[PDB]
Amino acid sequence: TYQEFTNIDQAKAWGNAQYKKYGLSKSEKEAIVSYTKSASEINGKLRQNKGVINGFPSNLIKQVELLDKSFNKMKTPENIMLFRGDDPAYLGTEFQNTLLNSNGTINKTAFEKAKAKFLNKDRLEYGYISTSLMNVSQFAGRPIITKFKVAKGSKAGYIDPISAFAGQLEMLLPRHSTYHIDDMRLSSDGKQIIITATMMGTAINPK
Amino acid sequence: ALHKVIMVGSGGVGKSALTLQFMYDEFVEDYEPTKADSYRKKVVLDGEEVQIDILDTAGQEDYAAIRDNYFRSGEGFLCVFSITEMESFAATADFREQILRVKEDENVPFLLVGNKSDLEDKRQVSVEEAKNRAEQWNVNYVETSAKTRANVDKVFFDLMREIRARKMED
Ligand SMILES: NC(=O)c1ccc[n+]([C@@H]2O[C@H](COP(=O)([O-])OP(=O)(O)OC[C@H]3O[C@@H](n4cnc5c(N)ncnc54)[C@H](O)[C@@H]3O)[C@@H](O)[C@H]2O)c1
Numbered sequence: 001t002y003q004e005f006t007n008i009d010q011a012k013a014w015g016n017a018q019y020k021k022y023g024l025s026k027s028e029k030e031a032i033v034s035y036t037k038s039a040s041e042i043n044g045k046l047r048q049n050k051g052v053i054n055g056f057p058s059n060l061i062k063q064v065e066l067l068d069k070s071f072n073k074m075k076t077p078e079n080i081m082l083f084r085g086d087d088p089a090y091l092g093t094e095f096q097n098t099l100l101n102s103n104g105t106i107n108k109t110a111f112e113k114a115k116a117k118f119l120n121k122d123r124l125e126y127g128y129i130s131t132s133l134m135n136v137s138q139f140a141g142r143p144i145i146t147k148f149k150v151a152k153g154s155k156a157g158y159i160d161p162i163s164a165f166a167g168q169l170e171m172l173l174p175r176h177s178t179y180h181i182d183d184m185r186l187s188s189d190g191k192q193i194i195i196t197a198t199m200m201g202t203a204i205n206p207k
Numbered sequence: 208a209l210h211k212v213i214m215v216g217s218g219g220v221g222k223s224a225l226t227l228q229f230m231y232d233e234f235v236e237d238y239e240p241t242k243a244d245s246y247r248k249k250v251v252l253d254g255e256e257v258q259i260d261i262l263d264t265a266g267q268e269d270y271a272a273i274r275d276n277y278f279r280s281g282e283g284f285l286c287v288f289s290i291t292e293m294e295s296f297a298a299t300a301d302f303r304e305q306i307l308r309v310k311e312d313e314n315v316p317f318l319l320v321g322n323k324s325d326l327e328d329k330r331q332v333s334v335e336e337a338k339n340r341a342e343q344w345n346v347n348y349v350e351t352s353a354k355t356r357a358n359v360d361k362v363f364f365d366l367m368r369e370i371r372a373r374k375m376e377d
């Protein structure tokens with residue numbers, strides 16, 4: 001069983017309790033703050049290169065190194081559910097302008113194609129994975145919702161106390177992580193795809 | 208003589224498959240993406256016995272000090288992209304910039320390699336754009352396939368010839 005927070009104040013209490021113990025350095029905090037301002041750019045380059053960083057400029061490659069290594073200090077003390085919102089391009093380029101019906105519902109053909117592509121399969125993410133402790137942030141309105149099952153001891157950092165966007169209850173996960181998609185269904189709304197996945201871990205494990 | 212070659216390029220372009228085709232004349236599919244290795248073999252290059260040294264980089268964890276070290280030690284570069292992946296082609300400019308930043312020599316032995324030529328049916332990068340970029344960079348462009356062996360020996364031998372010519376001055 002994975003903890004799933006049902007109250008914002010409780011989630012914050014749990015998150016703060018983890019954060020207090022991290023003991024992040026000044027440069028580590030700075031890399032993390034910058035990440036919250038620039039995630040889609042950093043993650044975009046990681047995705048463009050399938051995780052290869054040796055073509056990254058000095059500033060970016062140093063930030064990646066700091067982010068990577070900060071996860072040595074940030075682990076979850078228990079099994080936890082994390083929530084993530086995604087736009088259609090997350091399913092592939094062919095879904096980008098294709099996922100939605102004209103009335104805002106998920107197209108059933110698009111959905112069935114996505115289900116065939118991803119269900120009961122491992123998926124590798126080259127970018128860092130931004131998630132929230134709950135499903136009530138601004139990202140909860142995106143057409144794709146992922147519920148990640150993250151096991152006790154896994155690399156996972158509560159970065160809300162230093163985020164440029166406090167209130168998101170952000171839990172950051174390492175880049176180059178694999179997860180297994182266990183379930184894919186439509187919301188009762190018909191307006192969202194709800195994905196349940198089991199987080200497996202990251203390939204990025206510096207000494 | 209020992210000619211030191213570095214493989215560069217985005218994940219999944221065929222650096223490993225190219226290296227192993229050259230080294231052992233086999234097509235090796237899905238070699239561990241995050242695994243790097245060095246290879247060495249004696250070859251006859253235009254009637255002279257020499258050794259080639261290949262670093263097949265992984266690159267996912269090659270932080271500033273690591274990549275800067277091996278860019279400095281490297282004498283010639285095979286810059287690989289997949290003809291089926293525009294993003295990998297776009298990325299080639301990044302690897303070259305970072306190589307040029309440490310070597311401070313535009314005359315660095317360098318070949319642009321469009322790999323997966325057997326996948327013409329899935330081509331995303333035009334020959335036009337790649338040839339144009341190669342000319343802009345004053346380097347040769349060669350299309351390869353580690354699957355069919357197409358131009359594989361050629362790229363390694365051509366790069367060696369460039370390293371050799373650069374060593375001749377002086
Ligand atoms: N998305 C969330 O649920 C979430 C959670 C907590 C914090 N944040 C904050 O939001 C910002 C990051 O936003 P983000 O999560 O959209 O950034 P991201 O880099 O993960 O994604 C950027 C865009 O690309 C899409 N995308 C994600 N993975 C993809 C893939 N593998 N292939 C193609 N497209 C893909 C996303 O859906 C999004 O539209 C940061 O500032 C972070 O602090 C977001």
Ligand SMILES: Nc1nc2c(ncn2[C@@H]2O[C@H](COP(=O)(O)OP(=O)(O)O)[C@@H](O)[C@H]2O)c(=O)[nH]1
Nearest residue numbers: 218219220221222223224236237323352353354
């Ligand atoms: N069809 C085809 N597939 C290739 C070719 N070269 C590599 N591959 C495949 O593409 C994927 C990535 O290859 P790999 O050599 O590991 O790329 P690397 O990450 O750059 O080292 C693997 O599945 C290879 O089997 C090629 O020339 N043709």
Ligand SMILES: [Mg+2]
Nearest residue numbers: 222223239240
């Ligand atoms: Mg490889």
